[PDB]
Amino acid sequence: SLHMIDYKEIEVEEVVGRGAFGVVCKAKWRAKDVAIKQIESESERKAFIVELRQLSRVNHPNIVKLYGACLNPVCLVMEYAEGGSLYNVLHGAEPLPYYTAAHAMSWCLQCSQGVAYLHSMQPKALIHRDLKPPNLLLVAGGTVLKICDFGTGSAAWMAPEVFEGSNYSEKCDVFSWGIILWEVITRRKPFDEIGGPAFRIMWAVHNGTRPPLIKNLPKPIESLMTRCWSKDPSQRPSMEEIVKIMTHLMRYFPGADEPLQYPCQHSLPPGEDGRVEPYVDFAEFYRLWSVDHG
Ligand SMILES: CCCn1/c(=N/C(=O)c2cccc(C(N)=O)c2)[nH]c2ccccc21
């Protein structure tokens, strides 16, 4: 369900960055901004095709919309995400934006909403396999999140059974989502302290290492997070369950529709002594929670 496009109708504006594969650049098309992805080397052709056939089947507000695909120089034509990537908002530009507990929870809810749609696909469920903030885009002033890069570095978000070579299911995305939840709450890069080549993270995670626990994290959120981290994929919740849980929790996180507009100088202190401080503040959550339960 595409819509063939002629390159001459595009007219590029400027390169904005590289995706998981290929290059992305802003462009105009029929009186509206556009992002187009082209393959640099022909080795990326396989990824180009799979993403083409997969994105043609998806239609969800939390997944990047694919308009068409031109085969003259071979490129995908998608919607432009003005807000950039979530990874950039979290750890990127020199003037970093302030965000609240409501934004963090809202972002993770919207991500689970999109993945739940993929996992519900018929005949076969669609697994993303590369869920991480670099592949999550933001629009509407940083309020709306959209999943991108369906072509399938990423070791910090990968379930052990995946790089274990073992067979895996849709539950590998659940593991990645859990890491993302920890990441937005702490505004820390997962396993940044380990570093080195990728196999050093894989070894740690394979032996059961997980990101440190979060001081004063509400037990309902801690439970969900650590369940997603389970070694055994069958002990992880389905995305449908995560959506339901996160939806119910948002009752205690008002203000997710407030755009990102304030800067901050995120200090990020080196204090990984078992526990870790959250970046967001859960004071209001505990207050609103006590109102209902009392
Ligand atoms: C990695 C993010 C690159 N980037 C960006 N991407 C997109 O609009 C986009 C849209 C659809 C699909 C994809 C993809 N990867 O399949 C990407 N918009 C940006 C605006 C400012 C700075 C960087 C930007």
CATH of the domain at 280: 1.10.510.10
If asked whether residues 261 and 142 sit together in one domain, one would say yes
User: Considering 28, 48, 82, which residue would you say is the last residue of a domain?
Assistant: 82
If asked whether residues 43 and 155 sit together in one domain, one would say no
- Spot the catalytic one: 6, 33, 130, 149: 130
Looking up tokens 């196999």, which residue turns up? 199
Task: Measure the CA angle with vertex 220, ends 279 and 245; round to 5°.
Answer: 105
CA–CA separation, 222 and 80 (whole Å):
34
41 φ, ψ to 5°? -95, 145
Coil vs helix vs strand at 145 = strand
Identity of the residue numbered 55: L
Domain that holds residue 88: 83-294
Instruction: Please tell me if the CB atom of residue 25 comes closer than 6 angstroms to any atom of ligand 1.
Output: no
Experimental resolution (Å): 2.0
If asked whether residues 13 and 67 sit together in one domain, one would say yes
CA–CA separation, 286 and 289 (whole Å):
5
If asked whether residues 45 and 140 sit together in one domain, one would say no
For the question of residue 232 being annotated catalytic, the response is no
Coil vs helix vs strand at 160 = helix
- List for the chain the helix, strand, coil content (%; round to 5): 40, 15, 45
Number of helices followed by number of strands (H, E) in the chain: 9, 11
If asked whether residues 93 and 67 sit together in one domain, one would say no
Instruction: Provide the domain count of the chain.
Output: 2
If asked whether residues 168 and 196 sit together in one domain, one would say yes
Which method, experimentally, gave rise to this model? X-ray
In 232-283, which ranges are E strands? Answer: 263-264, 275-276
Instruction: Please tell me if the CB atom of residue 149 comes closer than 6 angstroms to any atom of ligand 1.
Output: yes
If asked whether residues 16 and 157 sit together in one domain, one would say no
CB neighbourhood size of 95 (10 A) = 9
Does the bond joining 269 to the residue before it have cis omega, within 30 degrees of 0?
Answer: no
Q: Which residues contact 15 (CB under 8 A, 6 or more apart)?
A: 23, 24, 25
C-alpha distance across the termini of the chain, in Å: 52
